From Swiss-Prot, chain B:
This is Glutamate synthase [NADPH] large chain. The lineage of its organism: Bacteria, Pseudomonadati, Pseudomonadota, Alphaproteobacteria, Rhodospirillales. Residues 1-396 form the Glutamine amidotransferase type-2 domain. Aggregate of 4 catalytic active heterodimers, consisting of a large and a small subunit. The active site is at C1. The gene is gltB. Binds 1 [3Fe-4S] cluster. Its cofactor is [3Fe-4S] cluster; FAD; FMN.
Amino acid sequence: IRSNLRTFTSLNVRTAEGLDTHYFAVLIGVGATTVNAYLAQEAIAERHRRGLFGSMPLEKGMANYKKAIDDGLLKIMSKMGISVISSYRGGGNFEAIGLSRALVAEHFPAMVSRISGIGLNGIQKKVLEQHATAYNEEVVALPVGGFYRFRKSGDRHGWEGGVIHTLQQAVTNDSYTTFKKYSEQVNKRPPMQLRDLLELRSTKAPVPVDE
Amino acid sequence: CGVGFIAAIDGKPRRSVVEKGIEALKAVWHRGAVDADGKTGDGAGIHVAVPQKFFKDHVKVIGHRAPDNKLAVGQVFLPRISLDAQEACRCIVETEILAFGYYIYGWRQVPINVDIIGEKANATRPEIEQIIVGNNKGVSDEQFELDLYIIRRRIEKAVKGEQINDFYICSLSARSIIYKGMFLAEQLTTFYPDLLDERFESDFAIYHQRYSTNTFPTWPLAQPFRMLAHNGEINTVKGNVNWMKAHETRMEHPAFGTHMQDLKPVIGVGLSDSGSLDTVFEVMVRAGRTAPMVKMMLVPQALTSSQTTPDNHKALIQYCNSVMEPWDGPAALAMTDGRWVVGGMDRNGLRPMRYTITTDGLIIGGSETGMVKIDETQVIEKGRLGPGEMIAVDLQSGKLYRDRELKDHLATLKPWDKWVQNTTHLDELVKTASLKGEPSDMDKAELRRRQQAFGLTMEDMELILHPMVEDGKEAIGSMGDDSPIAVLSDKYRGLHHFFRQNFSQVTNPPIDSLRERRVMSLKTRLGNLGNILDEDETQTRLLQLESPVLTTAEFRAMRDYMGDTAAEIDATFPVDGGPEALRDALRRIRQETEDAVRGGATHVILTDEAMGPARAAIPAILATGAVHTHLIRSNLRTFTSLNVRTAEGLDTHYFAVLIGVGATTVNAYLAQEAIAERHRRGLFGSMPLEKGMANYKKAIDDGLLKIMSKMGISVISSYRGGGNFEAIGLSRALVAEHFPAMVSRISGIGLNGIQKKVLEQHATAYNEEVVALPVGGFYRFRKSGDRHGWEGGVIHTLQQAVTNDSYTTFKKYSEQVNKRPPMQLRDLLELRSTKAPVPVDEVESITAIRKRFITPGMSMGALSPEAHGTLNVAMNRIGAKSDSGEGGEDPARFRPDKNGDNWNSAIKQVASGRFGVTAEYLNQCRELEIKVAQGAKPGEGGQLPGFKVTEMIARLRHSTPGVMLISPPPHHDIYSIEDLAQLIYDLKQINPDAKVTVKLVSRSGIGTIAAGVAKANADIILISGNSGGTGASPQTSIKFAGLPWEMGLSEVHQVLTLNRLRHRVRLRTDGGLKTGRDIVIAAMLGAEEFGIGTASLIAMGCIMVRQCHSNTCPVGVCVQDDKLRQKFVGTPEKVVNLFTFLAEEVREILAGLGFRSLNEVIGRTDLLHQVSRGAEHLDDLDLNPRLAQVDPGENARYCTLQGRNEVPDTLDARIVADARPLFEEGEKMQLAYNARNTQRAIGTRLSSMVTRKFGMFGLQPGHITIRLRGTAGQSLGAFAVQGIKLEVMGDANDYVGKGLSGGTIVVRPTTSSPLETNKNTIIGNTVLYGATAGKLFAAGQAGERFAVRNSGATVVVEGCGSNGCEYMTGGTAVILGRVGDNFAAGMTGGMAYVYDLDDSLPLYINDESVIFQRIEVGHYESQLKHLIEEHVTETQSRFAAEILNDWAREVTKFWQVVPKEMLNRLEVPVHL
Ligand SMILES: Cc1cc2nc3c(=O)[nH]c(=O)nc-3n(C[C@H](O)[C@H](O)[C@H](O)COP(=O)(O)O)c2cc1C
Ligand SMILES: CS(=O)(=O)CC[C@H](N)C(=O)O
Ligand SMILES: O=C(O)CCC(=O)C(=O)O
Ligand code: F3S
């Protein structure tokens, strides 16, 4: 854009990491003319090879996938009233929580990022770590996952069984004390949420609770 | 306001350095506009070192580890209302620090307390935030700032490209950080508590509060700037600014690597003058130059060519002057590149700057002195800066350098002289060819016809050229300029007519180019424009003249020496040309110069020589500008010198314009010609045509030096190209297109008109024979071509009218006056209204109206005693007011006479040479008029030819009989607006009843000043037109300085309104008001009072013959000669008739408009419509900007209460209270009180009170004595009459005994101070300014301009800055010590002795009017002795006492300084 060239080509992406509606949307409105999630058509195939769909043609499985991604989008677009993709494209209708200011400014269309976050360096690093895991070692299957739901996995969650128990306990047996261990269970973890990054110091000396 | 600095001489950080820095800032408010709001101020700042504990901890507390290095901080003002922008801002800020790969620990909202801010300010408050950076790259102190610098610019630049407003990085270094903002200095600590933390420690400080011509607060404009802090103003700014546009074309240095381009323009939009300075100072320091070197390259001291200066220094100076053209203007500076800390002065010591050195190894720089407690006991020294000096500290080595020693050092750095010796002075080469014979090659038949082309005349040749040749001085004249304003003229006038010389009013003072010529200069250099960034001898390789001025001889001298190097462009155009002739002509020249310069050319010669019957000449001025500009616009001007040959040039003005619109060099060739022709009819007599030119040339040289001094500028290189004119009459578009920046508030004609008029005059001179020029009636009415306001008929009719007392005759006069073609702007307005008319009876009354009229100040001296008092009688008879004038008023006159008539005048002036200014004069009135300026001669100050200085006159004025009175152009106690401010305070102190007025002269920019005047407590402001009258004044000012009142008066009306001050002050105007309508129109433009001089003179009889300077008045109006004064027929009754008519004619008009009063129409510009078109060609003016209303439609009403803008008490408040007995019983009294730098004008009120009850002299010396410990602030003892005595044990600031009036003031160090009385400063500047009586004793040295204008006070002091005893006219001035440059300049009358231990006085004194000898007669030797005795008695001065102890050997060491003009006048001769 910056160099007056974008009006000359179409820009088409082939992505391996692409799976659901969101990924497409972002891509698309950050430039993309056309997208192709090629390692998913694959993941689909494998699924269809072990008969997980019926005797449904892959051709058809593909169609469905596409339709969902099409409605995938149409929907993400309407969240902002936009009814048409030409106008949505490249428009940058995101908001970056996490990435660094500098970066987002340098590379993406205009999007806010009210707190710079990591930059190329970190990105680099995390990218590569995850890459080792799949090549600088050997791998049987994808882990389970505990994103969409707490398993007793590595993806933590606020509400995980332990704490829930203690809460329920606390409020059934009705002990403030039990309550008080739940909060601790909850307050002693590593940060998971921005408030988590904030200490509370003050300059007054303590007053008695009764007051 | 103030600047200050503090430094630990040893280099080692401390908290006290900051605590002191605050301490200061708490003692400057006495110098500023206090708001009734309690909060609002113009700006304050403190520049200290980034405190690494404090910051590092911070980074630690978030839980990082503190680096080993220094940690940087950016201090940043973000947009505060658009979050969207704050971001853009922070991304940019981060990106930039990021690509240098440094490190961000991140943002920190600065704590602040906005409760102490006013709304105006909270409104424009940015969001203040710190960003913390780390030197992860492990670079060096020096590299970090360098990089950071390129970063800040990078940001600065990008924000700009983004179009982001309100972003601003105060500081961003790891050495220094700035905490400035819009809040009262006393409250810096409150708005920013960080400062109160003990971790804030520092080896240095730089504070600064500031004032302004505003009500609007911008935050970035508060100082200190990044390297700099400035008290003053830099009048030479547009000059500087445009030079950089070229300086830059070549600046390149290796430290910025590939960065340079991001580096330019070094001066962004929206900077204040100082801001722009800091900008330049910075790049230079970022590229390698120390602080002190830069102060010099940019604010170099004056190279007086004298012994006073070692030769090393001179080299250096000469070096600088060749690289960079100064940045002039009053200037106290506080500076620092990373390491050094410097206090500096401008080349004229225009601003105070005391300092103290302590036992604890600190230096505290200051503007006043009581600014921060220090025990006398620990004072090791008490200095000050004088013109040009610096004082400094090298913090790395913890060494202090005083001026000499510091300048020594810099001399040391390079082979200054060897390098300087590299310049070719093509002077002698040029003088040679002149003596070899100024040629001439035209035959009268030609001279005459060209001459006609530029519409020249006899008046021109006789009146103006001649005197130049003869006396080598320019024509003096009299009476105002009543001709049309050029655009409206009927008769070929040349461009130079439309450019008005600018001059300065309250912002800065103008200089004395006579008494102070040694600091000024006209050096000129061709090809010295390379790398301000370089520091190599190759910078001295350039040619050098000593005047941009060249006689046809010298010109060719040069043009030859040039040669292959020069190029000649034909500034001319065809007449057969077509409607676009001159345009394409102007293109052509523009291009041709391009090619030339590109082609390799290094000098350009622009010329009209080929003017002929077929080619009109392009107006040299236009041609020079067109060329210079386009040259700048293509980065080329840095490659040539640009030299002009002009057939139309003749007077000083024309040179000035040419020069300052580009021209390097000028040659008035067809005028040297015209000189010759005159010379071959032996009109110059014996005198060789060569000596002829020589003179011409000096007249034009002093010519310029003067025109320059009008806006304090001391040096042509800064003046050049600076465009210091204002255009009236030419079109906006044009003036923009082709000349440097100048205002032209109403467009005017353009090329097509210009073309048409140029050509018309042309036909006049090549359409047929021409044996004689026409007579001309420009400087005087002839019954010829040029009209004037005052012309015979008109004068007769008026005289008839006021003499026979007929209003009908009056009316016939005014009709005569109003029925002509437009001559003045108001003439282009119609007055139409929408109300039906009212019956005249119904309007306000004459009694009422005439009271808004006043008779201007016209001095006793300029006018006959008879005329003067006539006026005072008329005005008091009708309950109005008159104005004493620049020159005294006789006190006999302080009573009504047997007939009831009252000769005393109601408004007394106060002007530069404080003429009769006395506690009793200042108290015999209702109003004090500070005269900063008259439209006849804005830049300058009165003249009274010597033969008018009668004895009575001389008695009045305490001047010397029959010796001439030329006044200092600036007031010596008004060098900047705070200064005005303080004069107004003293004035309101010595006279509790009067209102104070400020006479100012219209010019664009007046508006703004007007405001400041308003914030300074003035009650009335008077704007004077360009066309007013003068009894004596050079003719260029009478025809080229000033602007019409219709422009200035509205501008003040507008601006004052726009800042909500317009109700604080009343407005008055004068300038040619002869008629009823002239007075109505002035009201509608905003005026409430009108001044009427000349027409009042004419009623007293003036016939407008213009020999007011000559003392040959046919009629007794302006002449001191006795026989001649007997021909005077003026009468009160006549003047009264004048006013009566005027008012009635005013009422007649209002009634037609439907108003029943004047008030109902002030400001009402909706009642005026511009009609007039008055020329053949469509060339029109835009009178809008004058008619516009700021807040049109209904106004809110601010209640104004009847009285004067009142003022805060002082010590006098108590002193008086404590003196009941004095006033009640007569007792004698001794009182004691401490005194701080913050108490001003102490005693003055006392004095007013005493003068009122016992008179200046009814009390015996010492009757009421008040001792004071501590420090007196400005105006100590000002206007003290006899009976009062003030002992100040401690010390004082500027203006001790200003206007001293027979009172006594003594000042000595504290019994306990260990200081050597005579080796330390003790009182400020402009001490005893204009005094007339009393004594002053001072155990110590005094600063600049000591005893200036003293007219009769006796003083003893142990030393004294430069410019001492200047313009003194009476009194005795002893002086136990060394004495500054130019001592006794213009010292026409008193006497000074001067203990000189090194037989040096010879090297410092200004010969011209004075002589020195050793005491010989023994009554003079005795006089001295007794004073010195007194001195000692009063001051217990050892050093003095000791001189007494060895009288014998010692008397031997003094030097009697006695005025030439006093030699034969003196009772006891000075010689044996
Ligand atoms: C003869 C004469 C003497 C003047 N003397 C003074 C003066 O002493 N002080 C001053 O401040 N202005 C002085 N002026 C200017 C007048 O005070 C006033 O500004 C101007 O005269 C009025 O201009 P008008 O002449 O067109 O009526 C003088 C002007 C003239 C003509
Ligand atoms: C206190 S001050 O009047 O010297 C201000 C200095 C400067 N001309 C400015 O506009 O900041
Ligand atoms: O009388 C004087 O000193 C000055 C009068 C004056 O300058 C003027 O009237 O133009
Ligand atoms: S010379 Fe002045 S012009 Fe008036 S005062 Fe005499 S006529």
